[PDB]
Write a structure and sequence with these properties.
CATH class of the largest domain in chain A: Alpha Beta
Oligomer: homodimer
Strand content of chain A: 15-25%
CATH architecture of the largest domain in chain A: 3-Layer(aba) Sandwich
Number of helices of chain A: 13
Largest sheet of chain A: 7 strands, mixed
Number of domains of chain A: 2
Distance between the termini of chain A: 17 Å
Number of strands of chain A: 15
Strand order of the largest sheet of chain A: 2-10-9-8-7-3-4
Chain lengths: 360, 360
Amino acid sequence: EELIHAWIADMDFEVPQPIQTALKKRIEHPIFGYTLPPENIGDIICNWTKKQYNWDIQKEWIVFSAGIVPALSTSIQAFTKENESVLVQPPIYPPFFEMVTTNNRQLCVSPLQKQNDTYAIDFEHLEKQFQQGVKLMLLCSPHNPIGRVWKKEELTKLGSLCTKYNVIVVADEIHSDIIYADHTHTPFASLSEELAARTITCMAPSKTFNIAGLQASIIIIPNEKLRQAFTSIQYRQGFHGLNIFAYTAMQSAYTECNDWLNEIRFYIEDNAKFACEYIKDHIPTLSVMKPEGSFLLWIDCSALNLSQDERTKLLEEKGKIIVEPGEKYGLGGEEHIGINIGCPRSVLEEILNRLRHTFS
Amino acid sequence: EELIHAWIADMDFEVPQPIQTALKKRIEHPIFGYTLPPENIGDIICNWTKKQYNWDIQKEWIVFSAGIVPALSTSIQAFTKENESVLVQPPIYPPFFEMVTTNNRQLCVSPLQKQNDTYAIDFEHLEKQFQQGVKLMLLCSPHNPIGRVWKKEELTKLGSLCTKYNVIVVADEIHSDIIYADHTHTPFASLSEELAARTITCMAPSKTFNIAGLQASIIIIPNEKLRQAFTSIQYRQGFHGLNIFAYTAMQSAYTECNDWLNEIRFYIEDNAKFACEYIKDHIPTLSVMKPEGSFLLWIDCSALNLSQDERTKLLEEKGKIIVEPGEKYGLGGEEHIGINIGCPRSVLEEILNRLRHTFS
């Protein structure tokens, strides 16, 4: 009876207490004018990358942005010219396509290849695209929506191609802190100095701690030449820095929420296991590749041979549920749906229940 | 004593209590994910313009921006091509210059003229500039730093020049809510349908309520075609809207702070009269044309006959004070300084005493 929205971008868990506490505290100082980044924020961020990924960065490499997508667009404007090619690997988070085309760059794609039980990069096909003169690549790592956490060996092969054909890489690593137990996130730029010199790395506490609304993002750009190009775009667009509470939330997110994050990682991973088993056992018309990170489940509905409209209608009428349609993710997205497993188990159980009824 | 910094751009008064309260109340709900503008914010802004300026606007005209300077940039990108002319009237807030030039547009200027002991538009010079093919004009109303609150007759005459040469007008009206007793702010777009159809109006609670750090701005664009071009630029730059507390602060600023604002207006104007009196009586080497709005005092230091560096060094060493230099404001700014009178009387009194000692 009661409609459900199985897909939201945000995790369905309350923000860590320490963050709320930091925000309330900031308010008891009732001056809210122009602010520079707190003195310690740079050291706080350097510590985070070392602690989380064994990645040593310089404070000078840090640039702030009010969101990752803005950062993607800034990179496109800074590092390519109109009518130059920008490559992505579908199925991929839709704003990737949008930021390319709305800026009048040419879209190139190198679709990921669904293997048995996993998605993989098609290095042969990708190299062909680079031979066509790709200038910039938007890498998603971990990859939304399929949930791949790229292994060192995969990223190294990718990096070899990027060095060979001189492709600048924008690494969207916003899901880098929600990594499952048997996996480890390797920042693309950390592989070598060579790759650090051609990578713009985009990170944020937004998804991790559920503070997307606060608009805090951290862009790391080792190469001073690329970094100056990036900030020059920001400047001409009138960027002033982040809002006051973006800095406050970051300060707390990266220092006082380690326990919370550990508990959330485990809870989400358990949700992923629960859902993949449930679908395997009770909805045989569906198939799902187990995610290695993030809190999105990516479900293949191709066995039902439904059009997007048929599927969507059947889902809301017969299942009273609204999920993420996959078609807009590009090649590989057709006949797929996405659901948010970053929610209470009781809630996830009900969602799975609705899916069973619909496709059974 | 210790060095004083009378150049800050924020007023030195505490944020309204109601805004502080609204920020706390919002944090009591510890979900800070993506949010659309609160349902009632459209009506709140419409009621604001009607109440403050007797200006009737439509909800659909409203577009949000994380700051006014970003809106100036967006307008430049939306309404002109590279190497096309954008006109400003110096002395003027420096980012007006920067946003034109860093976006590779041709900067044109029509310096304000001093006459009858007030600043005025040089309409003959302005028209000459328009004949050379100006596409866009950045109007500052009230005008920073000189504090002119343009009269309806001046704005109508400006409007007819823009109509004659089909110039689009970006009206930066961020100081529209700090207007002194004997003056009235007339939004440029409110003058007529003809002018509304060619104007982008930029407003914000930032300066008024000392919440610049929350990055909340309102852009009103009556002409659907201009408005869609404006939002298209935002979109390609990745803009998803304002941060959560930007909406919260605005909701409160435009509904619950009317008593605070009336007290602030009176206090600031009283400060301006005090300062002009003090300078006229006790600092003969300085002159000041009185402001009609905002909280900046524009002081002519011509009679000192000093280079910028010498004036600045004398102020820091002898006066123990740092003020806003006028030189960066362009033509008409040379040998001027600015000071913030949006502060307690006791603070203003100390500032003025330091100016007195320096140039005595």
